[PDB]
């Protein structure tokens, strides 16, 4: 099966519309190492390890 | 599984159509698939009722 017609820029934009990226709602930055990370990601242990 | 369709033969030349539905309509008249055509999809996890279910025993201490 082949496409019967060329797809217009309008229909292509409609198709690719919901596939746009969205911003992450919550971002954690460690005050010690400065790493920017999602919740439930390990970067540092505290001092007197 | 969903509609108890018979499927195709396991041998005698059958080519990659062992569990498929076969024909889904007629040709050009009607030129379309009718509503309610039995096709694959989600099965179960739906509300159903069983009628005339017989109560055998009541346990009032445990509410069983």
């Amino acid at each position: 099966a082949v496409p019967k017609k060329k797809v217009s820029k309008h229909k292509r934009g409609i198709r690719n519309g919901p596939k746009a990226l969205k911003p992450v709602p919550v971002i954690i930055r460690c005050r010690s190492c400065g790493r920017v990370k999602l919740p439930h990601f390990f970067c540092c242990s505290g001092e007197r390890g | 599984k969903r509609w108890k369709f018979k499927g195709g033969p396991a041998s005698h030349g059958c080519s990659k159509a062992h569990r498929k539905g076969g024909s889904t309509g007629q040709r050009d008249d009607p030129g379309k698939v009718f509503k309610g055509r039995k096709m694959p999809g989600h099965m179960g996890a739906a509300q159903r009722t069983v009628k005339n279910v017989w109560v055998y025993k009541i346990d009032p201490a445990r509410n069983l």
Binding site: - | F34, K35, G36
Partner: protein
């Protein structure tokens, strides 16, 4: 409803008056239309013409 009784009538505008129809159960129907006139419609499922 079409505001075609107004001298300011415009076909692209909805400017009709509000029509309140009272006593709809007492409308006059002649002939044998009570038993012979049918409303028919199709639900979109084959074989399901309702009347």
């Amino acid at each position: 409803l079409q505001a075609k009784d107004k001298p300011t009538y415009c076909p692209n505008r909805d400017d009709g008056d509000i029509c309140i129809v009272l006593n709809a159960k007492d409308i006059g129907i002649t002939g044998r239309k009570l038993t012979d006139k049918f409303y028919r419609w199709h639900t979109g499922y084959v074989g399901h013409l309702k009347e």
